[PDB]
Design a protein around this ligand. Structure first.
Ligand SMILES: CCCCCCCC/C=C\CCCCCCCC(=O)O[C@H](COC(=O)CCCCCCCCCCCCCCCCC)COP(=O)(O)O[C@@H]1[C@H](O)[C@H](O)[C@@H](O)[C@H](O)[C@H]1O
Length: 322
């Protein structure tokens, strides 16, 4: 049979998958990074409390949980996304801090006060339209998107759910990796009873507040018509972006068989069971956050700590702060 029956997220990256080595920063890159570190390490720093309602008359200092989010890799994700333009990098990080506050996810978990709770969005995942399961060849956690399993009508809660799931897959990042792999299944699922500015908001969030997170996007069951249109524009897409897109290729070339859903060629026989999968996902992510924050506090609770150190168990810091 070779099939492995599974119904819960795989908690840890298996030892069989190596963590890609990071290329050291150049002299100039290091200098600019230190400027970002200095900016956010300023004890008198105050940031907007909202993005959509930003006001110079309403600024508040960084909370403990926000300093824990402002990691070495966070700075690097924004520096790369902004093409190493200091001004733009600082402004972008600042606005994401503001948006996280406005959206209800600035506390690194409902356990610290987040308005976006698992209970608030749980109903949105009842049909398994989004699933966090497994890791691919470069240690990236996998997030499955199955739009054909839509179970709710358009609402802001749908956006809150997408953001919550994105935050959870980030919680699943193995120490040393900070990008994810998306596996999108466009197949229509007539088993999931049909129901009975969301698109613009989702677009804004994805294009503004999650820089350098897309490692790979695996597409399958692409509508015939849709496929043709993708193939027509494909030759005109930037090389770096083209390298992120995978279609018309066996998924097993990018994901270990024992880390891939059998529906797409893998050996994992996965059947979504909300009452089993959901609580497991919530608890697994919660434990990862608890560990991450405990480490953060153990290391002084300062801005600029490395996610490699926060998500690991080693005693000595691999990236001591300047
Ligand atoms: C009900 C709920 C609805 C919720 C709404 C649901 C919407 C569902 C679909 C997709 C949403 C997916 C979100 C995935 C988020 C992952 C985290 C994330 O936000 O990644 C972001 C990117 O996310 C994505 O790219 C996901 C989209 C991949 C494209 C897939 C195309 C598929 C095309 C298929 C052909 C057409 C099929 C049509 C089928 C029609 C069927 C009827 C950030 O990008 P990244 O490259 O990491 O960093 C950027 C940075 O940001 C820029 O500033 C910089 O300038 C640039 O250089 C880079 O640094």
């Amino acid at each position: 049979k070779n099939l492995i029956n599974i119904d819960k997220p795989i908690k840890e990256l298996p030892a069989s998958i190596a963590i890609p080595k990071e290329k050291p920063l150049t002299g100039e890159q290091q200098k600019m990074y230190d400027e970002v570190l200095k900016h956010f390490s300023n004890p008198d720093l105050k940031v907007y409390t909202s993005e959509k309602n930003k006001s110079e008359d309403d600024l508040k200092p960084l909370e403990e949980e926000e300093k824990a989010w402002l990691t070495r890799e966070c700075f690097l994700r924004y520096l790369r996304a902004t093409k190493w333009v200091l001004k733009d990098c600082i402004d972008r990080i600042t606005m994401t801090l503001a948006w996280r506050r406005e959206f209800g996810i600035s506390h690194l978990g409902e356990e610290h006060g987040d308005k976006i709770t698992a209970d608030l969005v749980a109903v949105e995942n009842e049909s398994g339209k989004q699933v966090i399961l497994g890791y691919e060849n470069d240690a990236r956690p996998i997030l499955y998107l199955k739009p054909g399993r839509q179970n709710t009508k358009t609402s802001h809660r749908q956006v809150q759910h997408l953001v919550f799931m994105l935050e959870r897959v980030i919680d699943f990042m193995p120490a040393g990796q900070d990008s994810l792999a998306l596996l999108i299944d466009f197949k229509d699922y007539p088993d999931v009873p049909k129901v009975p500015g969301v698109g613009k908001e989702v677009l804004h969030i994805l294009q503004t507040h999650y820089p350098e997170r897309l490692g790979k996007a695996l597409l399958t069951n692409i509508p015939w018509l849709a496929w043709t249109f993708l193939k027509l524009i494909h030759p005109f897409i930037d090389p770096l972006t083209r390298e992120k897109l995978v279609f018309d290729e066996p998924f097993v070339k990018y994901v270990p068989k024992n880390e891939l859903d059998s529906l797409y060629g893998g050996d994992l026989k996965f059947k979504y069971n909300h009452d089993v999968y959901w609580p497991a996902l919530v608890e697994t992510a919660r434990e990862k956050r608890d560990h991450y924050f405990k480490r953060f506090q153990s290391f002084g609770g300062i801005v600029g700590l490395s996610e490699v150190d926060l998500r690991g168990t080693h005693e000595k810091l691999l990236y001591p702060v300047k």
